[PDB]
Design a protein around this nucleic acid. Structure first.
Lengths: 162, 74, 83, 82, 394, 79, 71, 98, 74, 166
RNA sequence: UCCUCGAGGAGGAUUUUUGGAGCAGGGAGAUGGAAUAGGAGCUUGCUCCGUCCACUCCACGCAUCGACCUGGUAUUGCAGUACCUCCAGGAACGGUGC
């Protein structure tokens, strides 16, 4: 059950709780996120929860994409061309993923508009100084794992590994 | 004196040198030739005045009611 | 003689709505009187403008001449507005 | 006499419309109403100090249109006969 | 060249200087209003009595027409009068009508007024609205505004003439005097009223009379009031003789020879008889078949010589030949006293040839026998034969 | 209930000096005596004067025919 | 004649541009003779502003175009 | 009624432009003056003209930037155009075609 | 058509009206009009510095009326 | 308290904005299921509290069980079931196959048993301190037997659900 | 009433659409820059003059309220919402009148 144009044209699309145009693509078990050109950047949020996506890549240019729900998936790697395809990506929910190393968070630093990031329920969050490395690598993010970044955490991230 | 309606006052002002000033600040001075019921003005040998200084002569000038602010009979 | 947005604005009288004027003034409150010419008369209204001067007044009246838009709740967008 | 009947008979023609805000929209006129509601298809709009954008459809009101631009090969003498 | 066929249609005409009957109303010398009324009424073909009465009324002479009931005598009296009124217009003087129509009944006068109003439709000509037994003030107010024709009762006309409400001037008042149902007006009951109506009239005025029946005494009384009348009835002009008995039998084309052989064998129709045929070769074949059947028969046609035809005529006159076959050339003009029986085995296309064949036997007041065989091919002449039998009384 | 047309007729009958403010123009106003009016609120001012509040000057024009589409507020003055 | 220019875009998401430079993207449900647009669950872009059911007057409308497929 | 008011009022000044085929100037609210021959008019001053020449003046509007450079005037020509009567501010008839 | 505005409840009440160009007045309404014209007797206008100037009975047209807020409980 | 589709979380940080807290609650609730509505106020009566109403009651129950006492913006929020039904949900609404139930309350009617069994999909019939519930599907009956083993309904007694024998 | 060839048939004058819209961002200083883009003294170096941004000074252009960041502090409350505790500092944003 791969993501095609007929699956995106038959999927439900409505208004979310934040008054944004969201398309519900849950319950599809798509192994790879592709063929997203049929939406023509008419959705403000993408609900791709409960899927089997392994890599968050292969997305076309969508300037209206501001929220991406990748919860309950097996995402273990992030694409390096995420900034060239989503310049206005501000919300990224990557809870309960397959990220084990902090080096997968290195392509996530290119998103300058990203402010809300969720990396909870992951083996990469259980490593030593994971939050300090995420604050040092991504200074544009203001809320990490439902927690506001303070000045002391930014000073601790800028002190170590400088 | 007697209360005069503006429509016979505009009908009787034809042929006399008046000056109609618009909302943009410019005025046109000339002899009133035609004045209809929709408060439109058509004058002959009109001269343009901007900020108290004359600009030039144009001749027959037609000014609508949507732009003309006031008119004074000289 | 009566329009469908005019009928939707007349049917939404008595609900917590807002009217944003052309100058940016947002009169919010319960729509007490809504005529066919977009005349909105509200009681216990609140002024939240684009200037931001938020205040509370006992009664307000905004005409349809300088009215830019109207923000209404979505309780009347289902029925009988489905055509 | 009436310019609305002359504007309504100018369908399927590539014209341009300049608004009061400086935005010029060039496209094929497909629909004209009595209130000069210009509905065009595959138009290109250029605003003031902005980039031109191409749209598949556009609907401009009559009160927002300031000027129009017709091609030189338009039969204005034949279309004026009511 | 077919002017004799209109007179043979069965319309007895009597008089000196009679005009020819018109074939249709478009070429009858009528006005535009009369033609418009005839087109609106739905008249495709005019009546023969109307075609005999309309030129006689348009010429300005007195006419007396007799026909059956429902033949259109009121239209035949109203249409040429309205055509002459429209073509020759006069000044509508006070209390003077241009036409005087006499009706014995009030309902008949109202029907004549309705027919005159229908014939003068879409025009300003209003003739009359008056009847007996009604208010005289309304009739005087209707007649004072202008009266073209006067169609009313003789008693109401006498009451209007006695009270100076309507009269005929001496110089020029009326030009036509119509008389509907003249058999009742010429009776003993309506004699002095019609006499006073005809006495106070203009000298230069035509008199028209129409009735369904006409006795000899009524016609003799009505002829004195008119000046050189023209009679028109049915049937006399080119009609069959009443002294010769006419018989029509429906037989086939092959059964006609068997019927002639049965009439020659059983009945006494073989000797002193004239047999009319269609062609000369068919007449020669019939003569050869009669001579082969042990019967003396002679033939006279255009294919034979003149001396042989003269010898055949001499043998038929002397009594040497029992039967004489002849073509249509010998049907008219031949006056033979021996011709007692006329056998028309072949029906001619024209009724004049059949009338000449029926009139060839039994002339000068004597009796005669005429037997004609009618076939299915002569369907157009069956109506003319029925009209000739109705006119001759057979 | 006092009608505005009746108040304008009473001001024209009283021949009092009234000041008229323009629409979207707070710097310059007019002042004069209204002689007559019409259905389109057209005022006929005799010996009118344009008063500029920024420059504190007054320029007389005379007989002026002011349209009703530009006059936003009208008040009565004692002068 | 047919007057099907506004009926073909019914129940669809359209983005109308205002005179001051604002853009309202909402589902057009009904209209009138004064071009009164009723945009249910509309977004205001110029930044994103949560508005919802916004009834904008026809006097402040400049142009309108199709945004995407109907929900 | 309407024809006499159009041939005797200010609209006759428009009617002399289409009958005698004369050139008139129209100054709009966008500081532009278009001189041309009026071909079609209406009661709402909807002017459809042919062979028009529109002149105006424009500023660089922070083109390069540092505090010494002037604006300039410009002009253009159009074969056939149509302008509504709302944006028409001034209409001047002058014998310029001869 | 031509329905008058619902101004019967705001009769003889002290309300504050806003006019175009940023003008503010306060006064008691003395009547109504179908063209949204309001007669304010003993009106006081707010200046730019903040001082209130009494102008008396004034007439405000409906073409520049922005918002009218009733200062009294009706 | 009966389980419902709306889960209410309280004891949260009231210093954050309303829209940011609503977006954070939506991003937290999207991992457990589709969030239909989010009711969040900042007034003096509803300070520091919000609620999320979902489409399915099982996703709301899993979000209330998993995020019980989770730290939200520095303060551990407490999640619980709603007292009344939501307005949006009310507007949108209007092993073996046989399972043996023991220690059931006698005051509960058949409608309460149907609402308790409505977490599982459509069953064949229900039989009524002992009860017998038979489902049309074997996996649905197994999920209903695994879910109702120690459920929180009428807390004065404990309900026990077991598979029927042959 | 029409058709055929006399005839036949049957709305530019107050709340929406002919617009009351257009234009310009205070002054000074031997302040600083036009990589590839000004002219003149007929390149380059220099001098002069009608276009910005950063800082400083006078008049942080001024006052207002809303959104927002730091610290301290109060509320533990079951609802369908313009917005929601208070204190102090800073002022990146919005509009109102001069």
């Amino acid at each position: 059950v791969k993501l095609t144009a007929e699956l995106i044209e038959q999927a439900a699309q409505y208004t979310n709780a934040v008054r944004d145009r969201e398309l519900d693509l849950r319950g599809y078990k798509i192994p790879v996120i592709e063929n997203l050109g049929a939406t023509l950047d008419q959705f403000d949020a993408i609900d791709f929860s409960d899927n089997e996506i392994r890599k968050l890549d292969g997305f076309p240019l969508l300037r209206r994409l501001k929220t991406l729900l990748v919860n309950n998936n097996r995402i273990c790697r992030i694409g390096e061309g995420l900034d060239q395809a989503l310049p206005c990506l501000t919300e990224l929910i990557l809870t309960n993923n397959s990220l084990v190393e902090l080096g997968d968070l290195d392509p996530l630093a290119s998103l300058k508009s990203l402010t809300y990031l969720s990396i909870l329920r992951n083996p990469v969050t259980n490593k030593k100084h994971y939050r300090l490395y995420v604050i040092y690598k991504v200074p544009q993010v203001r809320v990490l794992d439902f927690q506001k970044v303070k000045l002391k955490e930014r000073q601790e991230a800028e002190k170590m590994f400088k | 004196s007697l209360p005069l309606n503006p429509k016979p006052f505009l009908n009787g002002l034809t042929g006399k040198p008046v000056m109609v000033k618009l909302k943009w600040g410019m005025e046109y001075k000339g002899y009133l030739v035609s004045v209809d019921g929709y408060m439109n003005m058509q004058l002959a040998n009109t001269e343009e005045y901007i900020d108290g200084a004359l600009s030039g002569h144009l001749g027959e000038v037609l000014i609508r009611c949507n732009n003309v602010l006031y008119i004074r009979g000289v | 003689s009566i329009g469908v947005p005019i009928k939707v604005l007349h049917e939404a009288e008595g609900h917590i709505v807002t009217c944003e004027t052309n100058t940016g003034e947002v009169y919010r409150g319960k729509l007490i009187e809504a005529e066919d010419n977009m005349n909105c008369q509200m009681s216990n209204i609140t002024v939240t403008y684009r200037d931001g001067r938020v205040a509370q007044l006992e009664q307000v009246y905004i005409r349809g001449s300088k009215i830019r838009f109207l923000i209404l709740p979505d309780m009347l967008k289902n029925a009988p507005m489905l055509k | 006499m009436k310019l609305v009947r002359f504007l309504m008979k100018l369908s399927h023609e590539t014209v341009t419309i300049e608004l009061k805000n400086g935005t010029q929209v060039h496209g094929t006129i497909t629909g004209v109403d009595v209130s000069m509601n210009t509905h065009l298809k595959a138009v290109k709009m250029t605003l003031k100090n902005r980039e031109p954008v191409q749209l598949e459809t556009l609907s401009i009101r009559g009160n927002n249109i300031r000027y129009f631009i017709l091609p030189d090969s338009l039969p204005l003498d034949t279309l004026l006969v009511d | 060249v077919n002017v004799f066929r209109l007179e043979m249609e069965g319309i007895t005409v009597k008089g000196k200087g009679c005009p020819k009957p018109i074939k249709s109303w478009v070429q009858c010398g009528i006005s535009m209003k009369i033609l418009n009324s005839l087109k609106k009424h739905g008249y495709e073909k005019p009546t023969p009595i109307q075609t005999q009465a309309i030129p006689a009324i348009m010429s300005g002479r007195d006419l007396i027409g007799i026909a059956k009931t429902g033949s259109g005598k009121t239209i035949a009296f109203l249409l040429p009068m309205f055509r002459h009124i429209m073509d020759q217009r006069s000044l509508e003087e006070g209390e003077g009508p241009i036409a005087v129509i006499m009706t014995p009944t009030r309902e008949l006068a109202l029907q004549i007024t309705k027919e005159c109003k229908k014939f003068s439709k879409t025009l300003g000509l209003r003739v009359v609205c008056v009847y007996g037994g009604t208010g005289i003030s309304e009739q005087i107010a209707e007649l004072k505004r202008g009266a073209e024709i006067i169609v009313c009762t003789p008693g109401r006309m006498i009451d209007m003439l006695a009270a100076n409400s309507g009269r005929v001037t001496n110089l020029r008042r009326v030009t036509y005097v119509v008389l509907d149902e003249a058999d009742r007006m010429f009776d003993m009951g309506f004699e002095p009223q019609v006499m006073r109506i005809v006495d106070n009239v203009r000298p230069d005025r035509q008199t028209v009379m129409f009735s369904a029946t006409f006795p000899r005494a009524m016609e003799a009384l009505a002829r004195r009031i008119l000046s050189k009348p023209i009679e028109v009835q049915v049937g006399g002009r080119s009609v069959v003789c009443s002294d010769v008995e006419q018989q029509v039998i429906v037989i086939e084309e092959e059964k006609k020879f068997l019927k002639l052989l049965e009439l020659l064998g059983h009945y006494q129709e073989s000797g002193s008889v004239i047999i009319f045929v269609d062609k000369q070769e068919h007449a020669d074949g019939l003569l050869k078949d009669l001579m082969r059947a042990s019967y003396p028969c002679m033939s006279l046609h255009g294919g034979i010589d003149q001396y042989d035809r003269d010898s055949i005529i001499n043998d038929f006159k002397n009594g040497t030949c029992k039967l004489l076959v002849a073509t249509s050339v010998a049907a008219r003009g031949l006056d033979v006293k021996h011709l007692i029986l006329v056998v028309n085995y072949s029906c001619p296309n024209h009724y004049e040839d059949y009338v000449h064949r029926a009139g060839r036997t039994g002339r000068a007041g004597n009796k005669g026998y005429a037997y004609t065989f009618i076939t299915e091919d002569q369907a157009r002449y069956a109506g003319d034969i029925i009209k000739a039998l109705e006119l001759s009384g057979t | 209930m006092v009608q505005p047309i009746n108040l304008i007729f009473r001001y024209l009958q009283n021949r009092s000096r009234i000041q008229v403010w323009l629409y979207e123009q707070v710097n310059m106003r007019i002042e004069g005596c209204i002689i007559g009016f019409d259905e389109y609120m057209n005022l006929v001012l005799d010996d009118a004067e344009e008063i500029h509040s920024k420059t504190k000057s007054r320029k007389q024009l005379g007989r002026i025919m002011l349209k009703g589409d530009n006059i936003t507020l009208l008040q009565s003055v004692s002068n | 004649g047919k007057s099907s220019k506004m009926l073909q875009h019914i129940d669809y998401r359209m983005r109308c541009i205002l005179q001051d430079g604002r853009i309202f993207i909402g589902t057009f449900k009904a209209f009138d003779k004064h071009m009164n647009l009723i945009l249910c669950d509309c977004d205001e872009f110029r930044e994103k502003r949560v508005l919802g059911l916004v009834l904008l007057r026809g006097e402040n409308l400049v142009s309108m175009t199709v945004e995407g497929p109907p929900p | 009624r309407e024809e006499e008011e159009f041939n005797t009022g200010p609209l006759s000044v428009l009617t002399q432009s289409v009958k005698n085929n004369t050139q008139v100037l129209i100054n709009c609210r966008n500081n532009k003056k278009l001189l041309g021959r009026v071909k079609a008019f209406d009661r709402h001053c909807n002017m459809v003209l042919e062979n028009v020449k529109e002149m105006w003046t424009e500023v660089p509007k922070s083109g390069k930037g540092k505090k010494k450079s002037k604006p300039v005037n410009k002009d253009r020509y159009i074969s056939k155009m149509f302008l509504r009567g709302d944006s028409v501010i001034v209409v001047l008839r002058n014998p310029l075609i001869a | 058509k031509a329905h008058p505005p619902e101004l019967k409840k705001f009769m003889d009440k002290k309300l504050s009206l806003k006019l175009n160009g940023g003008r503010h007045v306060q006064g008691i309404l003395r009547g109504f009009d179908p063209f949204m014209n309001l007669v304010i007797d003993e009106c006081v206008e707010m200046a730019t510095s903040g001082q209130q100037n009494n102008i008396g009975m004034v007439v405000i047209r409906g073409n520049s009326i922005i918002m009218l807020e009733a200062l009294e409980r009706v | 308290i009966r389980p419902n589709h709306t889960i209410y979380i309280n004891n949260m940080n009231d210093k954050i904005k309303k829209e940011e807290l609503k977006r954070s609650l939506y991003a937290l609730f999207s991992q457990f299921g589709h969030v239909v509505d989010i009711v969040a106020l900042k007034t003096m009566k509803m300070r520091g509290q919000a609620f999320v109403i979902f489409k399915e009651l099982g996703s709301s129950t899993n979000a209330l069980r998993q995020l019980q006492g989770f730290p939200f913006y520095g303060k551990p929020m407490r999640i619980q079931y709603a007292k009344t039904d939501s307005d949006i949900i009310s507007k949108m609404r209007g092993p073996n196959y046989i399972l043996f139930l023991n220690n059931l309350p006698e005051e509960t009617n058949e409608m309460m048993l149907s609402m308790l069994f409505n977490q599982f999909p459509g069953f064949k019939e229900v039989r009524l301190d002992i009860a017998f519930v038979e489902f049309e599907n074997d996996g649905q009956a197994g999920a209903a037997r695994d879910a109702l083993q120690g459920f929180k309904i009428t807390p004065s007694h404990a309900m026990k659900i077991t598979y029927a024998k042959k």
